[PDB]
Design a protein around this nucleic acid. Structure first.
Lengths: 96, 389, 33, 111, 114
RNA sequence: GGAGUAUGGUCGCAAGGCUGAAAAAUUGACGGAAGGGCACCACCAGGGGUGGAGC
């Protein structure tokens, strides 16, 4: 995207919130809308229990995903100014 | 029991606003004057049954005389598979009895303006003997075609998108023997539940009425009836507009139970004039009398005269769809929305809606000149229950 | 009568979807192959 | 009704008169919000007794005196000026009771 | 060419019956087309309409008779009843005896039918 | 890049109501009389149930 390394976005809708199996990639993927350009791209939350911190209409930083749905390119790094792995590790509370 | 209303005027508007605001009402003295048939009407008690069916936790209580009801509303769930139906895609059945004189748009207009504020989808299926899909003489109800392509684009204006509305008829019917009866079944599927409707703005002049499209329907009569009606309506509107185009629709007959009978023999017409500017459409309808046998060219001339009347009269929205757009404007967010009504459009039903909103707790309306701009402050309620995932 | 509209205008008006307002053998090589 | 409309739209000069008289996504979103925030305060800036008093309520920022009727007397007997008074406005939905389904988690430092 | 026409017993509407296998029901005062009845494969030979003008029977050369309702002109029931082309039909005019919606039909197969 | 195989979308056709519920035959349709074959759903010779009381 763009010319930058990380993009910001709005979480439009957590697609695959009603998927059955817990660590499905359709369960982990989230449709976000990038601020700078306006397009809706899909991004992976790194973990299914870590999906619960991503709420609707939250400013979300996302980066590339460099390594079950092959081709979803982005991963959610920060949510509302706090790092998502820190939220998952219970280091910080999310400012809303 | 708390809030108190009187009279049988705007009964469905009072119950629907009570459901949407959550304010318990008590409507007294329904038919005090009528000694022959006092109490609730059959279409009114069937609307009470439908309201109980689609809501949840609502308690409705009709008195012994039938002339006073009280109503403590609950949440509009819709068709959830644990409480209302068995599957989430299953249509909730509603039967309305044979002694029903009002059209089915009398049930559909409150349900369609109560449906974007629900929790799950709404999948109501109106069957039974008394389901007339036509216009009535009655209280001059809209037809299904008039209702659909005249008022569901207003939800499209508000941001409840008509990509997900599915109103489909499976049989069509007029009244039949007298005003009572019907037979034609419908199903309405609202799958577009919004949090808060957008505060829209109808302010620019809807000047050039570009085209007229319409529907002429015949159930139980010959199919040359709609052709004669189209020639009459075109003979009136060809003085004014080059493109009037009216679809012809024909159904054989609907059968009701007594051993089944064929009922609902009639024919009618429904014109919709589309203005080139925005979502501004003027509609008019006319149906044959259910015992009379009048000329189809008389009916076509009558509906064309009513359409030219509404085109002459209306500011932006006609008075048939003005209560729906005004109560959705009141349900929107806490900003002002500006509608452009004509001075001839203002009606006692619209005025009674204003009185009911002021009694319920919505803000008043600001009326200024431009036809007059009415400006409504939203109350910011929206829908109460929705699973924020 | 000229009321017969078109298949496209029938598709927008008489369908179940309500109309939204926001729309307006040359050569021998090929012959042998 | 019907015959009156028949005469009023059978007069052809009336018909001809009516035929004459009728026939940077972030900054864009924030600008649409500011456009709505100008459309109100442009739309209820037209009358005092009707709009500024009854339509738009009692606008924010203005000092105001409230009269609350029906307060229990234990509040006036145990009123201390230290613990302050916060008056909040309930919505139409905030006075109804029912089963709230919530998403809860214990705190990190709660034992 | 008009094969058969009949009036109404209350002199309100007229009904001609053409060679084009169709029936045109007109108004009596001014001759404007009230409606037209179709659906006959062969030209209509005769017709008779009821004493209160709520029914028309229409006898054709395609070996059947039709019953129309004369409000909206819906065919009540097409009833194939003769082995040859039915010449004529007639209602009994008086409902003083309680049977005014009965009618006779006479055909080329040497039969009358009540 | 070529060749196959799938998967999900998008579009076009299908998708316009002389209309309103309950034939074929030179080969076909149905019989009758006579004569055969078979049958513990037939005759003949016996045997055994069920059916009376209770579960």
């Amino acid at each position: 995207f763009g010319g930058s390394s990380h993009a910001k976005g709005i979480v439009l809708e957590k697609v695959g919130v009603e998927a059955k199996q817990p660590n499905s990639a359709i369960r982990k993927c989230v449709r976000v809308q990038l601020i700078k350009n306006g397009k809706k791209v899909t991004a992976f939350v790194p973990n299914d229990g870590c999906l619960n911190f991503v709420d609707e209409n939250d400013e979300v930083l996302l980066a590339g995903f460099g390594r079950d749905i092959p081709g979803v390119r982005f991963k959610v790094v920060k949510v509302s100014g706090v790092g998502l792995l820190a939220l998952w590790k219970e280091k910080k509370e999310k400012p809303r | 029991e708390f809030l108190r209303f009187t009279g049988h005027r705007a009964f469905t508007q009072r119950l629907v606003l009570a459901t949407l605001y959550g304010r318990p009402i008590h409507i007294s003295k329904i038919r005090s004057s009528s000694a022959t048939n006092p109490g609730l009407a059959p279409h009114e008690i069937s609307f009470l049954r439908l309201l109980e069916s689609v809501t949840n936790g609502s308690i409705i209580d009709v008195s012994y005389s039938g002339t006073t009801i009280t109503y403590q509303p609950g949440l509009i769930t819709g068709t959830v598979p644990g409480m209302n139906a068995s599957l989430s895609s299953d249509a909730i059945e509603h039967v309305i009895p044979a002694t029903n004189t009002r059209g089915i748009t009398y049930f559909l207009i409150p349900l369609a303006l109560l449906a974007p504020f629900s929790k799950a989808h709404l999948n109501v299926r109106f069957t039974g003997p008394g389901v007339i899909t036509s216009a009535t003489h009655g209280a001059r109800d809209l037809s299904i075609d008039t209702f659909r392509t005249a008022v569901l684009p207003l939800y499209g204006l508000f941001g409840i998108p008509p990509a997900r509305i599915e109103l489909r008829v499976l049989q069509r019917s007029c009244a039949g023997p007298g005003g009572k009866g019907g037979g034609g079944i419908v199903e309405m599927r609202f799958a577009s539940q919004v949090r808060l409707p957008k505060t829209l703005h109808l302010n620019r002049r809807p000047g050039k009425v570009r085209r007229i499209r319409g529907v002429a329907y015949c159930t139980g009569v010959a199919a040359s009836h709609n052709n004669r009606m189209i020639t009459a309506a075109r003979g009136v509107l060809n003085q004014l507009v080059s493109d009037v185009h009216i679809a012809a629709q024909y159904d054989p007959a609907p059968l009701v139970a007594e051993q089944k009978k064929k009922t609902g023999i009639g024919f009618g017409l429904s014109l919709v004039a589309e203005t080139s500017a925005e979502g501004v459409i003027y509609a008019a309808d006319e149906v044959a009398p259910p015992e009379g046998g009048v000329v189809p060219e008389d009916i076509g001339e009558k509906c064309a005269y009513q359409l030219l009347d509404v085109i002459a009269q209306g500011g932006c929205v006609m008075a048939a769809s003005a209560p729906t757009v005004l109560t959705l404007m009141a349900m929107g967010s806490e900003d002002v929305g500006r509608l452009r009504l004509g001075r001839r459009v203002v009606s006692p039903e619209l005025l009674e809606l204003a009185r009911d909103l002021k009694a319920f707790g919505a803000a008043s309306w600001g009326i200024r000149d431009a036809d007059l701009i009415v400006s409504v402050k939203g109350t910011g309620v929206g829908n109460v229950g929705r699973k924020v995932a | 009568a000229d009321g017969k509209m078109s298949k496209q205008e029938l598709k927008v008006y008489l369908s179940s979807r309500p109309p939204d307002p926001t729309r307006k053998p040359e050569d021998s090589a090929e012959l042998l192959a | 009704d019907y015959e009156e409309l028949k005469t009023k739209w059978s007069n052809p000069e009336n018909i001809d008169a009516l035929r004459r008289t009728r026939f940077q996504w972030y900054e864009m979103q924030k600008a649409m919000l500011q456009k709505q925030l100008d459309i109100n305060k442009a739309e209820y800036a037209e009358l005092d007794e009707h709009q500024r008093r009854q339509v738009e309520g009692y606008r924010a920022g203005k000092y105001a005196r409230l009269v609350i009727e029906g307060v229990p007397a234990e509040f006036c007997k145990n009123f201390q000026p230290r613990m302050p008074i916060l008056v909040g406005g309930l919505s139409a939905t905030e006075d109804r009771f029912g089963f709230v389904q919530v998403r809860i988690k214990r705190h990190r430092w709660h034992k | 060419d008009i094969l058969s026409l009949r009036f109404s017993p209350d002199a309100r509407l007229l009904a001609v019956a053409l060679l084009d296998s169709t029936v045109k029901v007109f108004f009596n005062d001014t001759l404007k087309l009230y409606l037209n009845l179709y659906g006959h494969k062969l030209p209509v030979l005769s017709m008779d309409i009821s004493y209160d003008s709520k029914l028309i029977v229409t006898s054709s050369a395609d070996k059947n008779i039709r019953i129309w309702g004369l409000d909206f002109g819906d065919c009540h029931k097409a009833l194939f009843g003769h082995q040859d082309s039915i010449l004529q039909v007639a209602f009994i005019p008086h409902n003083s005896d309680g049977n005014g919606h009965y009618f006779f039909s006479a055909s080329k197969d040497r039969t009358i039918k009540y």
